């Protein structure tokens, strides 16, 4: 059965079904609450190369959605746009009533191609994609989300800045996936799994100020050296 949390004396206990306690008091349905908590609060990796490896494609399982009434401010949020090599779309369109996560600091927008097996993209660890007050089990196309879980509670008787970071991934869904951070329609930077979003913004600023942007009609991909960490090579 679904556990129910009881808060008393500023302490949280799991309700016991067989043992009937009389101390706890319920007065109205206003006390019952559902809260969604982000996975990043548990100290897990949040960058795109490590985050995108927790999602896998499957077929033969219908999706399910359950609502929640309160959430937590998310520092990292994701937005996916994946297409098959022939040109078809992988992720389904967002149904009516589904909206992106309301409070996101950095929105990682990833667009690319992959084999796209199966039909729906599930979470390998069994978590939920939170969305806007509607936690689902699959990923929808073009809608911002955030990994997290849901808990049910009995409550006791008693500014906003959004920044979008754009990526480009090749081989999405496989073990050999190549990621590229985008600073311009022609200039890219090779992406490693140790760059915080602020570091990527600083790299963009350095690219723009130092005049390393592509001047020809082709593509230019920079590679940052590991030791000095400030002199981009190629």
């Amino acid at each position, epitope marked *: 059965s679904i556990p129910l949390g009881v808060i008393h004396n500023s302490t949280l206990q799991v309700s016991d079904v067989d043992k009937l306690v009389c101390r706890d008091k319920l007065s109205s349905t206003n006390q019952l609450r559902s809260v969604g908590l982000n996975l990043e609060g548990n100290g897990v990796a949040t960058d795109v190369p490590s985050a995108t490896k927790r999602w896998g494609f499957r077929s033969g399982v219908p999706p399910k959605v359950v609502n929640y009434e309160a959430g937590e401010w998310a520092e990292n949020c994701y937005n996916l746009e994946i297409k098959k090599p*022939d040109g*078809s779309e992988c992720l389904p369109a967002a149904p009516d009533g589904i909206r992106g996560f309301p409070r996101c600091r950095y929105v990682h927008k990833v667009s690319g*191609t*992959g*084999p796209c097996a199966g039909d729906f993209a599930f979470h390998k660890e069994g978590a939920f994609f939170l969305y806007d007050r509607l936690a689902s089990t699959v990923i929808y196309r073009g809608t911002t989300f955030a990994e997290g879980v849901v808990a049910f509670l009995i409550l006791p008787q008693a500014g906003y800045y959004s920044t979008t970071i754009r990526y480009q991934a090749t081989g999405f869904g496989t073990n050999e996936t190549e990621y590229l951070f985008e600073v311009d329609n022609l200039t890219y930077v090779q992406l490693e799994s140790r760059f915080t979003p602020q570091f990527l913004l600083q790299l963009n600023e350095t690219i723009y100020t130092s005049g390393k942007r592509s001047n020809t*009609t*082709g593509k*230019l991909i920079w590679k940052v050296n590991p030791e000095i960490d400030t002199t981009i090579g190629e």
Partner: antibody, heavy 123, light 109 residues
Framework: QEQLVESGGGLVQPEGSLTLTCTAS?????????RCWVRQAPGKGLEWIAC?????????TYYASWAKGRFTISKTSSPTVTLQMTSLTAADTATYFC????????????????WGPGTLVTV | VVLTQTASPVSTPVGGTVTIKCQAS??????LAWYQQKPGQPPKLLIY???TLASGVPSRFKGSGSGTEYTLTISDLECADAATYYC?????????????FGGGTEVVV
């Protein structure tokens, strides 16, 4: 700026062999690494032959169904890429182009944005 | 996949719009590229993704269409705009590298 000059081509007897060389200059070879060959018979439409990911380790070589075994593209570390033809039948007389693939927001695709002048092959 | 173009020596007086249609045998999810080839010179890319203008291309050309039918429209016609036009379907290099060209439609000024 960017040039894709090609070398080779001319008059060769049937059931022969010939090698074409594509030289590239003026752009980042490691970044734009896909190079393809396109054939156009005199007065007819274009036709894809083969592609190669020259400029970085790994990659893949993609061939066409009609041109299998008779043609072979070579992975040269230098920007120059060679295409070797064998058993040149009388229908192979055409103009050959060395082209560089383009890219879109979702990655590199098969459409070509830079072309070479084209070399003649007569059998 | 087979692509059917207008397939006619289209003639249009200077200043008028000329439209070319490139029908396909199935849905291609807007994966068409429009090329212009003058006699003797190698082809030049004009349109990719059926809507995006290539770099250094005048805004006179426009592309539209989706599904199995796509169109290329030249709003203003000049003397230089007299060459053969092609439409190709392309794949992404992550998977296959198949590329299928059209037939070719010449334009008479």
């Amino acid at each position: 700026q960017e040039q894709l000059v090609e070398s080779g081509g001319g008059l060769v007897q049937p059931e022969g062999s010939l090698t074409l060389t594509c030289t590239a200059s003026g752009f980042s070879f490691s970044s734009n690494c896909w190079r393809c060959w396109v054939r156009q018979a005199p007065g007819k439409g274009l036709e894809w032959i083969a592609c190669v990911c020259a400029g970085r380790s790994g990659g893949t070589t993609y061939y066409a169904s009609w041109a299998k075994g008779r043609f072979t593209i070579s992975k040269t570390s230098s920007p120059t890429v060679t295409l070797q033809m064998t058993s040149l039948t009388a229908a192979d007389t055409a103009t050959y182009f060395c082209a560089r693939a383009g890219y879109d927001d979702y990655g590199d695709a098969s459409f070509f944005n830079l072309w070479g002048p084209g070399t003649l092959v007569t059998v | 996949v087979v692509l059917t173009q207008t397939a006619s020596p289209v003639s249009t007086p200077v200043g008028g719009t000329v439209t070319i249609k490139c029908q396909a045998s199935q849905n291609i999810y807007s994966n068409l590229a429009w090329y212009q080839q003058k006699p003797g010179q190698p082809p030049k890319l004009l349109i990719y993704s059926a809507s995006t203008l290539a770099s250094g291309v005048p805004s006179r050309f426009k592309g539209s269409g989706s599904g199995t039918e796509y169109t290329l429209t030249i709003s203003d016609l000049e003397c230089a705009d007299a060459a053969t036009y092609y439409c190709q379907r392309y794949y992404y290099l992550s998977g296959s590298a198949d590329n299928t060209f059209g037939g070719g439609t010449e334009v008479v000024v």
